[PDB]
């Protein structure tokens, strides 16, 4: 879930995921990091997995 590829998973990554899911073009986004659960779609479940990482890891 390191969407900005800075080496940490934190609130910056959450903001970028929310921006992507709100339809924005997000500069400096790592596409390969978005499908966190690997089900082939990028959606609210990936956001949830990211939140759980920030909350628990």
């Amino acid at each position: 879930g390191d969407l900005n590829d800075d080496g940490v998973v934190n609130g910056r990554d959450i903001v970028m995921m929310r921006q992507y899911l709100a339809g924005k073009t997000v500069s400096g986004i790592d596409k390969n990091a978005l499908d966190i659960n690997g089900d082939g779609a990028v959606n609210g479940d990936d956001l949830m997995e990211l939140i759980k990482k920030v909350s628990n890891n």
Binding site: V15, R18, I51, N56
Partner: protein
Amino acid sequence: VKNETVKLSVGTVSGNPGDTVKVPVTISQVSTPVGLICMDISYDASKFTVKDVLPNTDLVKDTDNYSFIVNTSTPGKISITFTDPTLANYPISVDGILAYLDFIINSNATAGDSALTVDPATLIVADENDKDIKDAASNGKITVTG
């Protein structure tokens, strides 16, 4: 110049072993509305146990959609992440209390001051358009007393 830096300040409280204490975390000198806060607060886990971390709902809205995320998985460290899930409607735009830290003072806690420290290197404060905002932190403390 002073009011161009938004400040995240941990409060100062006292209590005796066995009691709980509520430590405010305050945001002040808000200028640019704040869309993201990431902060780490260190505490002495030999003396205190985190009971809860509670947002101030006057400032922190949309908690049902994970505007306020707390990580207490590492003993002695509290990581708080504030975001506006709507990316528009609920930035922090005025000064106030961000959250309260609820600590148990352990039965064995020895007397005296114990610092509650904000890591300046991991402190993140950004505006609604994902631009970093000038920011600073101020540490707090718990004094263990009779």
